[PDB]
């Protein structure tokens, strides 16, 4: 438990995808890269979190 987190591939997918596609096109991200349980809000949130570190 402690604190849940995403896996290496999922993080890599988001970072590698969003950076080249756009910070507001989660639909396309989900289309190409596979995820565990993402939709749009999750992708957006986590990306912003990563950006601000």
What does it look like?
It is classed as dna-binding domain. The entry lists the keywords MYB repeats, TRF. It forms a monomeric assembly. DNA-binding domain of human telomeric protein, htrf1, NMR, 18 structures. The protein is htrf1. The organism is Homo sapiens. With 53 residues, the chain is an all-alpha fold. The longest helix is centred in the first third of the chain and has 14 residues. It is globular, with a radius of gyration of 11 Å. The protein has one domain: Arc Repressor Mutant, subunit A (Orthogonal Bundle), CATH 1.10.10. 62% of the residues lie in helices and 0% in strands.
Layout of SSEs?
Elements: H1 8-21, H2 26-32, H3 41-52
Structural key phrases:
monomer; Arc Repressor Mutant, subunit A; mainly alpha; 53 residues; Telomeric repeat-binding factor 1
